[PDB]
Design a protein around this ligand. Structure first.
Ligand SMILES: Nc1ncnc2c1ncn2[C@@H]1O[C@H](COP(=O)(O)OP(=O)(O)OP(O)(O)=S)[C@@H](O)[C@H]1O
Ligand SMILES: Nc1ncnc2c1ncn2[C@@H]1O[C@H](COP(=O)(O)OP(=O)(O)OP(O)(O)=S)[C@@H](O)[C@H]1O
Lengths: 326, 373, 69, 105, 424
């Protein structure tokens, strides 16, 4: 099974990747991107009018929408609605769904403090009373004068914590209230698996496409691939004793004398004698103790001759030869 | 003769010259360079920064710069409590030290507008705390953010053992952000900066403090795997009492404690020829590389001793005592391993520190184990 | 030249004839002119300067001249 | 196994009894002592050994033997030499070798 | 302290101090040492320097239990009271929770009862602020290492402060402990002193016995012939045969080198002669005596020899019927672990494969206790009982399943001795 693999790739370090990535995402398709941004700007009065009807507005589409939501929520809408009702403008409570550390307790503790504490609602705070406390919020809000006092934003609604099911139903009861406007965005292709006709009854979602093919700068940070071990032990050797460099150099030679697999490895006895030959290893214990340091940071393997072999590729070890060992 | 060597056991370093350049704005009251000070362990690095700040505080203008040790927290609140302890004041502490935005209100000084720099000691307890991208990396993320607009900024100086922590940073943070960039490392001083400090730490000099080339010999042949030469002088301070007890001599005394029984003193452990027989009996049971019970070993011990009649078959209770004679010398270890039938039930699996190469030499001299091989 | 003659001393430090990292000066002379390589042995200062290069390579030391630590 | 041959039969026990009777007949005695059986068993075991080419006192004697060189030898030619002049046979000390190996001496 | 006044009572009706009673008084494990003589100095000269110079060091000793490391360091501090310190026995295993030792230290500086949290704050506040003396014994260090090493880092980080008036003394089980459980960052702080304690040797094991037998070996007692009471009518003597004491030494030094094990096997062998002396004359509880070699021959063997072989032949019939079926499956299949229903399948089959013989009086009783009225039992009589009896005995082992057929059974003792004891 001769497969080309990501290990057999010309790799790129940390500062080299992120800088040339920053060059593309700020200079690749710049002119048509704001050219799209001016086209969709005329839809902004249409969103203002429908949002008076308490409609949970939901934005789908390819690409990141994070920049677009923050322009649309903060600068455009939130002072426009305060001027049209008649003083600080309408409070914006974003929810970063790409941040996995969102819970149901903490954000709702913000909500009841963002909303009015007209009564002693801490008396009803008791043991899951969250649905209980919001139910007492809802029926009171059915008989209030209709005006928006809060707009909340939920970025990346299919996020790693917001897509949890006890959190989803929590947002469902918020959306039936007329005083708050719910402007959220998702990115998943299976996002309408999240809602049944029970929740969408509470939601009354409407949909709009926004596809600007954004790079998702902030949304790439928490995500990881093998760019983010061959690269792990690449830094430990840069800070050690000078003898460990030499005893790894003698290790890496005869382990690449023969991918870097088990079969190219060496026996412990002769390697003790080999590192006794260059006046390096005194005995087995002095060898093994500064070999456990290569073991503790998982920089070498052993299987069974008593074969110690390096788990990095054929291409990687000669890169480890000519750069850091030399 | 005691008082010369009673005093033996107790600007100054050539690494302090680096950090004053790295604190080049700390005497002009501006924000200094970006300080993430790491190190391989034992390299003096805990007391290294402690040497700098104590020389900073004894030198230094209103003077208030505090340092706390992150050991017993697991949680980012009470650090911002301990910076309040240099004020000797009173406030509402709990909310202000909890949230990211709550720290920002705390950074408005009172008496004379001297900027503050914090020192985070032993940051690796919080790095190597609870799960990374949930709490601890977020804790790392939140502390290194210095986007504050006045020059009164909480400059971090944190420290760590293992150097994986930089690659653990997110790609936004690695875009030249905060205290990142100057990853000032400290290679372990072989003898060329640490021994000379010992020389100046021999300011009060006795006459016979030994041939110093042997001290140089001590430094050269300890620098294979070491970081603390005063502690490796604390092994000279033990051997200097050896020449008081007798009214690298000791490293020679300590390695023969560790190297032996495989080459020579294996037969010291087995003066009994049956102890030689029972030691080969363990390795013959190791063919089935299983949980090597004291019974499965006793199974192969009987079924071989009925074939070759070298001795009578002995008791299991005798088999219990004889394998413990193999135990106390340090050859074979016994552990109560896992079998999960009814409860966590403990059968005893053994493990041998001998090889067949170091076996075959000591058995060809005795042709009575030669039937057994 | 220098790698081979020290390489004999490696397997001759593998045995306990020096008993420690200490070794006498007569232990050297019974391990150069007694052992296998003939006429490679340099002058009285030169292979005595040759063992300095090993000390400069920090693998073996010279001390208390009747012995060497 | 590999070097084995035959098994123990009751005819061999009867032959051991007959050889002990022949050894007692050669000493012209009316009774069979303990010295004949230990000689006959040694005879029948050394007859096949060429293919490879009452205890406390004995323990005390071994200790006395040790009080000279301190040697734990496996097979004996000069330990047994101080035993036959006393009154005990070659078979009693033969058990004292194996038993005592449990003392690891 | 307080209640030892209340632990005393009055009426003590003249207890008979026999011959071997006064032996066991000094054969108690309580009351300069011969074996670890010079190593006492190696601790003390390491300790005397730091004490009279106001520093902070660490001393690490290891060894198997029974070698005096509980004892020797107590003898270090004991003479030091004659010549500035606060002695604490911070035992590891005597702490219920591992954090509870923190409470003791803050208690043993001023007398306050504070948090393990709140203690170590003020402890850290002590160890870097006080202008200028504390001896602490961190015994049995396997206990306080287990959770996440955050406790063990503290106890050596306090040593690093040059303004810390503390002297720590660690005593472990193994020298390996800061290399197979701790990190290297602790292993830098542990130092490289590493004073090894070996076992005792059998010559010194003679030299430790007579220290207890100082004023009583081959001495004389004053005895009335009526009650068996001895006083340090006859005037008798009691001698100890030193060769039997020697053969006690040559075993215990061989297997363990344990100083409790040497004393206690002499203590066990002492009371064997006690009851045999009381058997022959009967002085109850209200020419020249000795202790034979034959006493320590039994008592040393009494440490070894078992009874599970004697237990098995003294069990019930259906117990021995059970194991004989169980080895039959293990030689049929060679899988050492048989399903429970197959054993019930076998004990049915092991009836009729034997002939029509005693077996019928068995087979009548094996399925009904007489009583031809009630019969036709599927599994045998008391089959739950013997299987429960073999379970709590430790001979058998049966994994937990609600199915009473496919639950596996595993042997727990060696199956050959099970085969061997079955033969009787
Ligand atoms: N160059 C030096 N100058 C002055 N004191 C030194 C020097 N090197 C070592 N020391 C002292 O010897 C000690 C040995 O360092 P350690 O504290 O054991 O290691 P460290 O200081 O904890 O750094 P780590 O292990 O990376 S946290 C230091 O704490 C100082 O007290
Ligand atoms: N050299 C000795 N001289 C006199 N009595 C001794 C000697 N060695 C041990 N003992 C006694 O035997 C007891 C054995 O306890 P220790 O050996 O001190 O404990 P230990 O070796 O630490 O084993 P532990 O505590 O379970 S780790 C001591 O309490 C003394 O009563």
């Amino acid at each position: 099974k001769s497969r080309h693999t990501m290990s057999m790739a010309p790799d790129v370090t940390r500062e080299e990747f992120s800088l040339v990535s920053n060059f593309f995402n700020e200079n690749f398709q710049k002119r048509p991107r704001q050219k799209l941004f001016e086209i969709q700007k005329k839809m902004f009065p249409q969103y203002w009018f429908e949002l008076t009807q308490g409609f949970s507005l939901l934005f789908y589409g390819v690409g990141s929408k994070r920049n677009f939501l923050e322009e649309f929520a903060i600068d455009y809408l939130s002072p426009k609605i305060a001027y049209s009702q008649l003083v600080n403008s309408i409070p914006c409570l974003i929810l970063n769904g790409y941040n996995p550390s969102c819970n149901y307790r903490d954000v709702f503790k913000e909500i009841t403090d963002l909303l009015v504490p007209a009564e002693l609602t801490r008396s009803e705070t008791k043991g899951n009373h969250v649905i209980l406390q919001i139910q007492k919020m809802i029926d009171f809000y059915k008989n209030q004068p209709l005006d928006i006092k809060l707009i909340l934003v939920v970025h990346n609604l299919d996020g790693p914590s917001i897509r949890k099911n006890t959190f989803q139903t929590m947002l469902s009861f918020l959306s039936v209230i007329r005083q708050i406007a719910i402007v959220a965005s998702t990115d998943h292709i299976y996002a309408p698996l999240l809602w049944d006709n029970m929740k969408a009854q509470n939601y009354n979602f409407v949909f709009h496409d926004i596809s600007n093919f954004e790079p998702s700068t902030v949304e790439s940070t928490f995500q990881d691939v093998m760019k983010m071990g061959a690269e792990g032990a690449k830094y430990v050797l840069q800070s050690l004793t000078v003898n460990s460099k030499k005893m790894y150099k003698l290790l890496i030679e005869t382990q690449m004398q023969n991918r870097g697999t088990q079969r190219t490895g060496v026996e412990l006895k002769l390697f003790n004698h080999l590192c006794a030959a260059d006046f390096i290893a005194s005995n087995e214990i002095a060898l093994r103790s500064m070999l456990r340091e290569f073991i503790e940071h998982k920089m070498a393997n052993i299987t069974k001759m008593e074969i110690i072999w390096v788990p990095y590729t054929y291409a990687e070890l000669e890169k480890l030869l000519k750069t850091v060992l030399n | 003769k005691a008082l010369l060597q009673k005093s033996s056991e107790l600007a100054r370093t050539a690494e302090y010259e680096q950090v004053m350049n790295f604190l080049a704005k700390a005497i002009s009251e501006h924000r200094s360079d970006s300080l993430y000070i790491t190190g391989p362990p034992g390299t003096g690095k805990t007391a290294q920064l402690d040497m700098i700040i104590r020389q900073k505080f004894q030198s230094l203008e209103s003077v208030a710069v505090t340092s706390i040790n992150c050991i017993s927290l697991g949680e980012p609140s009470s650090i911002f409590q301990k910076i309040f302890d240099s004020f000797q004041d009173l406030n509402g502490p709990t909310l202000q030290i909890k949230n990211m935005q709550h720290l920002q209100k705390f950074l408005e000084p009172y008496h004379k507008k001297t900027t503050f720099v914090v020192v985070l000691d032993e940051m690796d307890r919080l790095l190597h705390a609870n799960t990374s991208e949930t709490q601890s990396v977020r804790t790392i993320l939140e502390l290194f953010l210095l986007a504050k607009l006045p020059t009164v900024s909480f400059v971090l100086i944190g420290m760590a053992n293992s150097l994986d922590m930089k690659d653990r940073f997110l790609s936004r943070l690695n875009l030249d952000r905060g205290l990142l960039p100057q990853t000032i490392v400290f290679q372990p001083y072989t003898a060329e900066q640490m021994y000379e400090i010992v020389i100046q730490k021999m300011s009060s000099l006795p006459t016979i403090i030994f041939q110093p080339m042997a001290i140089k010999f001590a430094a050269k042949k300890c620098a294979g795997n070491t970081g603390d030469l005063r502690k490796l002088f604390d092994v000279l301070r033990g051997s200097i009492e050896i020449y008081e007890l007798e009214k690298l001599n000791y490293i020679a005394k300590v390695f023969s404690k560790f190297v032996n029984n495989n080459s020579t003193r294996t037969r010291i452990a087995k003066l009994n020829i049956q102890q030689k027989l029972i030691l080969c009996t363990i390795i013959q049971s190791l063919k089935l590389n299983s949980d090597a019970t004291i019974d499965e070993s006793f199974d192969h011990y009987i079924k071989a001793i009925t074939k070759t009649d070298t001795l009578a078959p002995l008791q299991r209770n005798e088999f219990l005592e004889i394998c413990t004679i193999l135990e106390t010398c340090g050859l074979v270890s016994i552990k109560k391993t896992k079998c999960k039938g009814k409860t966590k039930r403990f059968v005893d699996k053994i493990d041998v520190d001998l090889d067949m190469r170091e076996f075959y030499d000591e058995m060809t001299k005795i042709s009575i184990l030669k039937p057994f091989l | 030249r220098l790698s081979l003659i020290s390489g004999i001393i490696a397997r001759l430090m593998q045995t306990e004839i020096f008993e420690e990292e200490s070794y006498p000066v007569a232990s050297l002379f019974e391990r150069i002119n007694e052992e296998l390589p003939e006429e490679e042995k340099f002058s009285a200062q030169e292979y005595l300067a040759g063992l300095k290069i090993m000390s400069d390579r920090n693998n073996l030391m010279v001390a208390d001249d009747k012995v060497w630590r | 196994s590999k070097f084995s041959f035959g098994q123990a039969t009751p005819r061999t026990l009867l032959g051991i009894i007959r050889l002990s009777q022949a050894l007692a007949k050669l000493r012209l005695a009316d009774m069979v002592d303990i010295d004949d059986v230990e000689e006959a068993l040694r005879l029948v075991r050394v007859s096949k050994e060429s293919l490879y080419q009452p205890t406390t006192k004995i323990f005390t004697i071994i200790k006395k033997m040790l009080q000279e060189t301190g040697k734990n030898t496996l097979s004996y030619e000069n330990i047994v030499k101080t035993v036959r002049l006393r009154g005990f046979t070659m078979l009693q000390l033969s058990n004292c070798i194996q038993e005592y190996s449990y003392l690891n001496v | 302290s307080r209640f030892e006044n209340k632990l005393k009572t009055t009426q003590k009706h003249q207890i008979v101090e026999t011959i071997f009673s006064k032996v066991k008084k000094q054969l108690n494990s309580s009351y300069y040492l011969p074996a670890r003589e010079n190593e006492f100095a190696s601790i003390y000269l390491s300790a005397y320097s730091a004490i009279e110079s106001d520093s902070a060091t660490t001393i690490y000793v290891a060894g198997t239990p029974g070698v005096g490391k509980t004892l020797t360091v107590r003898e270090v501090v004991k003479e030091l009271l004659s010549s500035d310190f606060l002695y604490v026995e911070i035992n590891g295993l005597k702490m219920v929770k591992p954090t509870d030792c923190y409470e003791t230290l803050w208690n043993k500086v001023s007398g306050e009862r504070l948090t393990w949290a709140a203690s170590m704050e003020s402890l850290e506040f002590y160890f870097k602020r006080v202008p200028k003396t504390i001896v602490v014994l961190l015994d049995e260090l396997d206990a306080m290492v287990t959770k996440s090493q955050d406790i063990m880092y503290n106890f050596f980080n306090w040593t690093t402060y040059e303004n810390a008036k503390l002297i720590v003394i660690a005593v472990a089980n193994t020298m390996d402990l800061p290399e197979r459980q701790l990190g290297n960052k602790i292993t830098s702080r542990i130092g490289f002193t590493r004073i090894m304690f070996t076992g005792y040797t059998h010559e010194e094991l003679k030299n430790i016995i007579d220290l207890r037998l100082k004023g009583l070996n081959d001495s004389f007692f004053y005895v009335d012939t009526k009650t068996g009471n001895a006083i340090l009518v006859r005037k008798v003597r009691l001698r100890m045969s030193a060769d039997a004491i020697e053969i006690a030494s040559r075993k215990v030094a061989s297997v363990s080198g344990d100083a409790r094990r040497a004393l206690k096997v002499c203590k066990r062998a002492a009371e064997i002669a006690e009851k045999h002396y009381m058997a022959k004359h009967g002085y109850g509880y209200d020419g020249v005596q000795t202790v034979h070699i034959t006493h320590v021959m039994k008592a040393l063997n009494e440490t070894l020899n078992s009874h599970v072989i004697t237990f098995m032949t003294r069990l019930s019939f259906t117990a021995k019927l059970f194991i004989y079926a169980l080895l039959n499956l293990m030689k049929k299949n060679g899988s050492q672990e048989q399903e429970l229903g197959d054993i019930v399948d076998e004990i049915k089959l092991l009836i009729e494969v034997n002939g029509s013989n005693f077996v019928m009086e068995i087979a009548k009783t094996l399925f009904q206790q007489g009583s031809d009225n009630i019969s036709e039992q599927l599994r045998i009589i008391s089959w739950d009982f013997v299987l429960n009896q073999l379970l709590d005995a430790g001979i058998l082992f049966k994994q937990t399943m609600k199915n009473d057929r496919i639950c596996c059974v595993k042997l727990n003792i060696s199956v050959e001795e099970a085969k061997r004891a079955m033969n009787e």
